[PDB]
Amino acid sequence: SNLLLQYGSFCTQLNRALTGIAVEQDKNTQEVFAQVKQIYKTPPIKDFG
Amino acid sequence: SFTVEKGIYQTSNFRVQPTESIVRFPNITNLCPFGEVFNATRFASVYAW
Ligand SMILES: *[C@@H]1O[C@H](CO)[C@@H](O)[C@H](O)[C@H]1NC(C)=O
Numbered sequence A: 001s002n003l004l005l006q007y008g009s010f011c012t013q014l015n016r017a018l019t020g021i022a023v024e025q026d027k028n029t030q031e032v033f034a035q036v037k038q039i040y041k042t043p044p045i046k047d048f049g
Numbered sequence B: 001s002f003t004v005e006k007g008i009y010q011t012s013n014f015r016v017q018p019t020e021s022i023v024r025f026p027n028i029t030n031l032c033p034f035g036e037v038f039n040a041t042r043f044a045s046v047y048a049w
Helices: A002-031 B034-038
Strands: none
Touching: none
């Protein structure tokens, strides 16, 4: 660890890239599924012709 | 960095420090025969080492 202390920039950029990917996954899910702002409920009656 | 903005961060390990040491060797009593190989009366020829 004391030897690796001089590669802090390399580790910081690695963790930054991975954190960006991780946030991007949640963003992708939000764009795909969270388009509708209201949670509509199915009607009790299913008279859909 | 001396300032962290709002969010959740994955922390690299810095917290644990060992404090005690354990040594576990086979329990042997005999001293090794240094005198038979260093104090020998006669050594061998190099060809018949
Ligand atoms: C080797 O021989 C010398 C005497 O020549 C003696 O003083 C010494 O104790 C011996 N060392 C060992 C490891 O037997």
